[PDB]
Structure 1
Amino acid sequence: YYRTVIFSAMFGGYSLYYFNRKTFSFVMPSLVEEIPLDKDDLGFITSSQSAAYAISKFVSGVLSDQMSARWLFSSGLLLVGLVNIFFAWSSTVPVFAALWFLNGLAQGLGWPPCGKVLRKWFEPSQFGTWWAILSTSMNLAGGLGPILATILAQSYSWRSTLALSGALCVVVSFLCLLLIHNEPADVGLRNLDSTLQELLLSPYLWVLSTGYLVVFGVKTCCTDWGQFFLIQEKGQSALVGSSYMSALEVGGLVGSIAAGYLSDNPRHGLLLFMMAGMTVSMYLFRVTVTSDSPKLWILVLGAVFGFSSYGPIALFGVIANESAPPNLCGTSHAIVGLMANVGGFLAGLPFSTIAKHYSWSTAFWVAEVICAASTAAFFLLR
C-alpha cells in the first residue's frame, strides 16, 4: 500500500521531471522552424541545462542530509512547472537559456530526494531493483515524449505542449505535496534500519567516472541531437526523428531492465560488450541511414543504441554503489553524477559547436570517435 503509493506518485512524478528535462529536446523542430536559432544557441541552452543540473545534483546530495526529501521534490516539481510555463511565454534565446538554467537547478534538486525516499522505504538489499524500476521512468517519459510532442506540435503548437506539461507538473506538484512521505516514522509505520581524499585519488572512481562521462555524453548527444541530425542532414521528417528518440528510449527501457538480469570483475565484461555495441550502433547510424533507408531500420538502430546506452548507465550505477565505502557512499555517487553531467555539458555546447563548424556528420564522427577511443582504452585497461 504505502510502498505502492510511494513509488507510483514518484514514478509518475519523476516522469514529469524527465518529460520536462528533455522538453526542449522534444519540441526542438518546431522551435527551430518557427524562429531561427544558432546551433551554438541550442547547444548553449542544453549546456546551461547540463551545468545547472551538475551543480544542483552535487549540492542536493548534501541537501538530502540537511533537508527533507518530500519538500524538495514537491518544490522542485512546482519550480519545473513554473519554469516551463514561463518558457512557453518567452521567445528569445537569452531568456530561454536563463529559464532553462533554472530548469537545470530544479531538476537537480529532485532526484536525490527520490534517492532519500526510496532509501528510507525499502530494504537495502532491495535498493537495486527499485532503483532500476525508478530509472526506467526516464525511458518511459522519453518514450512517450517525442511522439506526443510531434503529434501535438503539428496540430496545435510547441507553446501549447509546453503549457500543458507545465500545468500538469504544477498539478502533480500539489499532489506530491500530499502523496509521498519522507519518513515512515512520521506516520508511524514501524521504521526499518582523510579517506575522502583517498576516494578522490582512487583510480577506479576516475575510470568509472570518465566512462560514465563518455556514456552519458554520447547518450545526451544522440538523444538531444539525433532527431535534429535526421531532420537537417539525412532528409528524414520530424516524425521519423521523434520516433528515433522514442525507439532510443524504448531500447533504453529494455537495457536498464535487462542490465539487472544480465548482471546477476564479470560485470565489467558485460559493460564493455555493451559499450562496444553502443559504438557499433552509432557507427551504423552515422553511415547506413539514408533518405531511401526505411523507418524500421532506424527504429531498430535506436533500440540497439538504447539497449547499449542506458544499459551501461545502469551498470555504472550498480558498480558505483559496489565500489563505494558504506560510510560515505553518497559522496561517490555525487562525484560520479558530477562527471556524468560534465559529460552532458560537453555533449551540449561544444558538440553543437563542432556540428555547425564542420558538419553534423563530422559531429557524430567526433562523438563516435570519442566513444570508440573510450571503448578501446577500456579494452586495454582490463
Structure 2
Amino acid sequence: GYGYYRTVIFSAMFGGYSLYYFNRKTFSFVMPSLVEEIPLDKDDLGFITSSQSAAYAISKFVSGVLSDQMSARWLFSSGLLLVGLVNIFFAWSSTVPVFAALWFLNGLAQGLGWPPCGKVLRKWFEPSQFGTWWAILSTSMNLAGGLGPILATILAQSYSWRSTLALSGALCVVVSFLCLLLIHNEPADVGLRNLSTLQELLLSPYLWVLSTGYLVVFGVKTCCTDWGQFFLIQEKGQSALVGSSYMSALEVGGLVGSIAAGYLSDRAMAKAYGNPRHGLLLFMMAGMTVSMYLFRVTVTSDSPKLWILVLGAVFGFSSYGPIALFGVIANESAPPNLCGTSHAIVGLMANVGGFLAGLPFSTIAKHYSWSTAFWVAEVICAASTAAFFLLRAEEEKRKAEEE
C-alpha cells in the first residue's frame, strides 16, 4: 500500500536523523571521559565545537544545493556513512588537530543529513500531513539530545570511550546501509502514484520576506536561549536553579511548540486566502513578542517560580514553533526541484541571525544593561511582527482588489 512505504520511510528517516543528531554531539556527550584520558584545554574544546559549527553552517547550504540535484536516498545514506566512518576514525585518534579535522568532516556530513529528509518528506507527504511529520522528524533532534547524556553515561559505565564511539560509528554504518535499503525517494520509484528556474526562486520576494522573518525569529531564539540565564542571574537576581529550570522549561515548551506548530498548521491546511500556514505563524510571533514583554517587564526579584516557568514555556511554544513553520514554508513554497535551495537559504539566514544574536547582543548588554539588550531584541521582533501583519493585511487587500 501507500501507507506502508509512508511509515517505513518515515521510520527509516527518523532513526537516521536521530543517529545524525546523536553523532552531531557525541564529542559533547563523551567530554568527561575524554578530558579524563587526555587533557584538553577549554579553548581546544570550544575550537572543536566551533569547527563543527562552521562545517555544519557551510554544509547546510551546500547540502541544500546538492540535495536539489542528487537523489536524496544516496545523499542521506552517504552522509550517515561518512558520519559513522568519521566517528570510528575519531575513536582511532588520540590528538587534538586530528580530532578537529575529523570533527570538521563530521560537521560536513551532519549538514549533509537533513535536506535529503526534507526532499523525501516533500515527495511522500501531501501538505495535509507534511507539517506535522516535519515536526515529528525534527523531534528526533530533541530525542537524541534527551537520550544523549543518559546513553552516554550508560555506555561510559559499561565501556570505554574508544569502544563507545566505535559502537556509535558501527551503528551509524549499519543504519546507513539500512537507510540505503529502506528509503525511497518518490512514489514513482515504487510504482505508486507520484503527487521553475533558480533565478525565479532568488528573485521571488516571498523567499526573501521569509528570509528576514527567519532571521528575526532565529535571532530572538538565539538571544533568549543563550542569554536568558544571564538575564535572570545578573539583573533580576533570580537563582541558578531558577535559571536552569527556566531553560529546561523553554526547551520543553519549544518541543511542544514544534509539535503543535506542525499539527495545528496541518489542521489549518486541511481546513482550508493565501497560505494557510500564516495564521498560526504570525500568531506565534505575536506570542513570542508578548512573552518577551512579560519576561522583560513583569519578572522581578520577587516574581514566583511558576510565572517564570510559564513565560519560559510560552516563549518556547512561540519560538521553536515559528522556526519549524519557517522550515515547512521554506520546503513548501519552492518547486520540488528547488526546495532544498530554499531551505538552504533559510539556513544561511540561521547563520546570519546567529551571528547578530550571539556576540553583538552581549556587547549591547554589557555596555548599556541587560534590560536594554532584551528591549532591543523585543523592539526588533515587535517591529518585524507588526510588519508581517501589515504585509499579510496588504495581501488580503490585494486579493480583494483583484476580485
Measured after TM superposition, the shift of residue 271 of structure 1 is 2.4
Q: Can you list the C-alpha shifts for 1:331-360, whole angstroms capped at 9, x where unaligned?
A: 333322322233345455666787899998
User: Does 1:331 pair with 2:334?
Assistant: no
- Structure 1 unaligned segments of length 5 or more: list them: none
The TM-score normalised by the length of structure 1 is 0.71
Contact 1:47 1:344 in 2 (8 A): no
CA distance in 1, matches of 2:381, 2:148: 26
CA distance in 1, matches of 2:30, 2:231: 14
CA distance in 2, matches of 1:169, 1:312: 31
Report 1 or 2 for greater relative contact order, CA contacts < 8 Å, sequence distance ≥ 6. Answer: 1
Q: Can you list the C-alpha shifts for 1:30-73, whole angstroms capped at 9, x where unaligned?
A: 99999999998777665544443343222223323443322222
CA distance in 2, matches of 1:36, 1:368: 42
- Identify if the C-alpha distance between structure 1 residues 94 and 241 changes in structure 2 by more than 3 Å, giving closer, same or farther: farther
Which region of structure 1 is more displaced relative to structure 2, 206-215 or 99-108? 99-108
Which region of structure 1 is more displaced relative to structure 2, 212-221 or 41-50? 41-50
- Identify if the C-alpha distance between structure 1 residues 375 and 124 changes in structure 2 by more than 3 Å, giving closer, same or farther: closer
Secondary structure at 2:158's aligned position in 1? Answer: coil
Identity over aligned residues, as a percent?
100
Measured after TM superposition, the shift of residue 112 of structure 1 is 1.6
Measured after TM superposition, the shift of residue 137 of structure 1 is 2.4
- Identify if the C-alpha distance between structure 1 residues 299 and 171 changes in structure 2 by more than 3 Å, giving closer, same or farther: farther
Please tell me whether Structure 1 or Structure 2 has the larger radius of gyration of its CA atoms: 2
CA distance in 2, matches of 1:315, 1:30: 39
Measured after TM superposition, the shift of residue 312 of structure 1 is 0.7
- Identify if the C-alpha distance between structure 1 residues 10 and 341 changes in structure 2 by more than 3 Å, giving closer, same or farther: same
Partner of 1:69: 72
Contact 1:40 1:353 in 2 (8 A): no
Contact 2:68 2:337 in 1 (8 A): no
Measured after TM superposition, the shift of residue 246 of structure 1 is 4.8
Please tell me the root mean square deviation across aligned C-alpha atoms, in Å: 5.3
Q: Can you list the C-alpha shifts for 1:163-186, whole angstroms capped at 9, x where unaligned?
A: 765554345334434333345666
Contact 2:247 2:312 in 1 (8 A): yes
Measured after TM superposition, the shift of residue 311 of structure 1 is 1.0
CA distance in 1, matches of 2:296, 2:44: 24
- Identify if the C-alpha distance between structure 1 residues 24 and 233 changes in structure 2 by more than 3 Å, giving closer, same or farther: farther
- Identify if the C-alpha distance between structure 1 residues 222 and 198 changes in structure 2 by more than 3 Å, giving closer, same or farther: same
CA distance in 1, matches of 2:164, 2:370: 28
The TM-score normalised by the length of structure 2 is 0.68
- How many residues end up aligned between the 2 structures? 381
- Structure 2 unaligned segments of length 5 or more: list them: 267-274, 392-402
Contact 1:139 1:250 in 2 (8 A): no
User: Does 1:167 pair with 2:177?
Assistant: no
CA distance in 2, matches of 1:216, 1:43: 22
- Identify if the C-alpha distance between structure 1 residues 70 and 139 changes in structure 2 by more than 3 Å, giving closer, same or farther: same
Partner of 1:198: 200
